[PDB]
Each structure stands twice: as C-alpha cells, then as structure tokens.
Amino acid sequence: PEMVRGQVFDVGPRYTNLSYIGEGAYGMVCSAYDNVNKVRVAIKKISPFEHQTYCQRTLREIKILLRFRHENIIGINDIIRAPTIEQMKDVYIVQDLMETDLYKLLKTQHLSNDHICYFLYQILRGLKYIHSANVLHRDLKPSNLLLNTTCDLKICDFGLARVADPDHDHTGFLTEYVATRWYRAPEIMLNSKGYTKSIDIWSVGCILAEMLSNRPIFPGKHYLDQLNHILGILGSPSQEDLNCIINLKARNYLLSLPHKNKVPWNRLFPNADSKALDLLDKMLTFNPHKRIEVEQALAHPYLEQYYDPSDEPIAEAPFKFDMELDDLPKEKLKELIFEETARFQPG
C-alpha cells in the first residue's frame, strides 16, 4: 500500500503513481493514474468517521454529485473503500483532475476581460443546473472553482450544500454561520439561515468583484466586520430594504449606524467593462428578494457572446434527501455512507 506525506493512501490496484495536490480539514487529494481508463484522475481520501460534521459533509456531497452530471460541476466517477463497515476507516472519492483553481490564478495572474467573462459564464452555467435541482451550493469561492489548461471551469466541494428551503430561512440577529465569511450575503448576519438561491448569487457577485481587482471585495476579519465591509461599499440600506427586515435587533442595528453613501462601482473598478459592473451591481444587491437570479444573470448583456439557454442544461428532477442529516449520529451516517458507495464495489 502506497502512501503520500506520511498518510495511508490504499487505492490500488486500479489507481497508481500518486502525487500530492492538497490537504483539507478531514482529508487529502492526490493525482493518480487510472489503469482502466488510462487517464490521470484526482482522488480525495476522506477520514470523517470520528466527527458527525465531517460525516454529514461527506454524505451530502456523495448523494448530490452522484445524481449530478454537468460539464461545469465536478463528478464522482468511482468510490474506493473497504468491503465491510468494520474495515472501513476511510473513503476514496475519484473525481476530475484539474491543473489549477481560481484562488491560485488570482494570487499571481491578471485576468483579461475575456477571461473574467468566460469564467463568470461557466460559474453561472454550473449554478443554473445546481439551482434547477433545488440545491444550494452555500460555499462558492475561488478555491472551490477548479480550472484546466484551456480555462474549463468546474464547481467542486458540496459539503455545505442543502435543498432550498425559503419558508424556513428566517432567524435572529448574529446567528452563527459555517460558510466562508468573505462570501457571506449581508442577510446572513441580519436574519437569514442561507436556505435561499439568493445566497449563492451573492457569493458569485463577490467572485466577480475579486476577478476584476485580484483581491476580495469584502475581507471581513470577524463575524460582524463582514456586514460593515458590505455596508461600506453598498452604503446605508434604503427605507424599503429596512422595512423587509422585521427582526427588531437586526433593524435597530442598521438604524444605529451613521449614513454611508454608495461607493460607485466604476470608482472601485476603473478598468472594468461597464456591462460587467451593471451585472455586479445586480448580484451584489443588499435586498435578497431584489437580487438577480441565475437565469437572469446568464441573459445579462455582459454574457451575450456565450448566452444560449438551449446549451445551459437543467437537472431532470428536483433533489430530495430521504432523511434529515442534521440530527443523525456519526455511527448511523457511517452506514448511510457505506450504502451510497455500495454500487462501486467489485462485486
């Protein structure tokens, strides 16, 4: 059994010639040569059975990506694990191998307007399919956007993905959230659980703004600082947008702040295309109900060179979890992970 950087990586005999890529919070990704299809692939070793959270993230992703099939979404083409639940200590998920990601690119490369336009198109084409399945990604950021040498984009990491639930989206002021801070919609800190499609559009808006300047538009250093960064550019919410926030603690917090004017997009981004900034404005709308939807975003004049709704596929049916995974112990989640991966075993 071959191992990478002092960690067991038993994926043989089908996958050999391992090379390190990255290491997550509860796993490791390596590139490996597939002896059946004779092509290099990415294998993600997962060790989640000691924590309920990691088991929940593993299962959600496996169930969603096995039912999804789209050019701009990472796939699960094979799953390797032990033949019994007793012997299963790890799970190896075989996915698409991509040379780089948008986080890596933005650190050192200046993106031409053509590149920004093409990247945004593929993100939204991928998101159209995700949202048509009534699924929310909930953690869109440059590191979860993989790219190959020809700039083909794939959305990855569905660990925080959920079925859309707009009727149960309301919550109190300063409710704790898991998803990456810099890409959190303003309503998360005010009165939202992130159970609507509009939280993903906000994250895409932040990604677009980041592609234009090679720096995160709202780099909050802590929970409430995130909202203050958003209000610093958007300005004070209108009376209309304030009236939509019925929660008194959230509304009175916004009312306590001095009046702040809107920073114009052309001042923040002097070299950006005017159509790119008009679409940015619509994605970074304070009110989630007035925020542009994925299909509307794809039809925006900025993406006219690529827009073709007949070549922007949707899922065949809406997604539905058989049971709620929020209140299941790590032991039961192990069984569910064992069951969902059974179809990939040699027998």
Contact status: 30 vs ligand EK6 (CB under 6 A) = no
Q: Are 61 and 161 in contact (CB under 8 A)?
A: yes
Contact status: 79 vs ligand EK6 (CB under 6 A) = no
Q: How far is CA 293 from CA 4, 68, 160, in A?
A: 43, 21, 20
Contact status: 52 vs ligand EK6 (CB under 6 A) = no
DSSP lists the bridge partners of residue 20 as 30
Contact status: 53 vs ligand EK6 (CB under 6 A) = no
Cβ neighbours of residue 301 closer than 8 Å, sequence gap 6 or more: 275, 278
Q: Are 164 and 187 in contact (CB under 8 A)?
A: no
* CB nearer to ligand EK6: pick between 101 and 187: 101
Contact status: 95 vs ligand EK6 (CB under 6 A) = yes
If DSSP codes are grouped into helix, strand and coil, which group holds residue 31?
A: strand
Residues numbered 310 to 339 that lie near ligand EK6 (CB under 6 A) are none
Output the smallest distance, CB 72 to ligand EK6, in A: 14
Contact status: 29 vs ligand EK6 (CB under 6 A) = yes
If DSSP codes are grouped into helix, strand and coil, which group holds residue 118?
A: helix
**Which positions make up the binding site?**
21-29, 44
**Which positions make up the binding site for ATP?**
21-29, 44
User: In this structure, is the dihedral angle defined by the CA atoms of residues 118, 123, 129 and 134, taken in order, positive or negative?
Assistant: negative
Contact status: 32 vs ligand EK6 (CB under 6 A) = no
**C-beta atoms surrounding 89 within 10 Å:** 12
Contact status: 18 vs ligand EK6 (CB under 6 A) = no
Contact status: 172 vs ligand EK6 (CB under 6 A) = no
Report the C-alpha gap between 79 and 61 in whole angstroms: 12
Output the smallest distance, CB 165 to ligand EK6, in A: 23
- When binding is defined by CB under 6 A, the residue of 2, 14, 24, 182 that contacts ligand EK6 is 24
Contact status: 194 vs ligand EK6 (CB under 6 A) = no
* CB nearer to ligand EK6: pick between 8 and 317: 8
* Catalytic residue (choose from 139, 157, 200, 241): 139
DSSP-H helix ranges across 28-149? 52-67, 102-108, 113-132
If DSSP codes are grouped into helix, strand and coil, which group holds residue 132?
A: helix
**Window of 91-99, 121-129, 179-187, 280-288 that interacts with ligand EK6 by CB under 6 A:** 91-99
Contact status: 21 vs ligand EK6 (CB under 6 A) = yes
Output the smallest distance, CB 307 to ligand EK6, in A: 28
Instruction: Look up tokens 């989630």; give the residue.
Output: 288
Report the C-alpha gap between 289 and 244 in whole angstroms: 9
**Residue spans of beta strands (DSSP E) within 137-271:** 145-147, 153-155, 162-163
Q: Are 228 and 256 in contact (CB under 8 A)?
A: no
Q: Is 139 a catalytic residue?
A: yes
Contact status: 201 vs ligand EK6 (CB under 6 A) = no
**Window of 21-29, 112-120, 160-168, 182-190 that interacts with ligand EK6 by CB under 6 A:** 21-29
**C-beta atoms surrounding 170 within 10 Å:** 14
Residues numbered 126 to 155 that lie near ligand EK6 (CB under 6 A) are 143-144, 146
Catalytic residues: 139
- Contact residues: ligand EK6, CB under 6 A: 21-29, 42, 44, 74, 95-98, 101, 143-144, 146, 156-157, 159
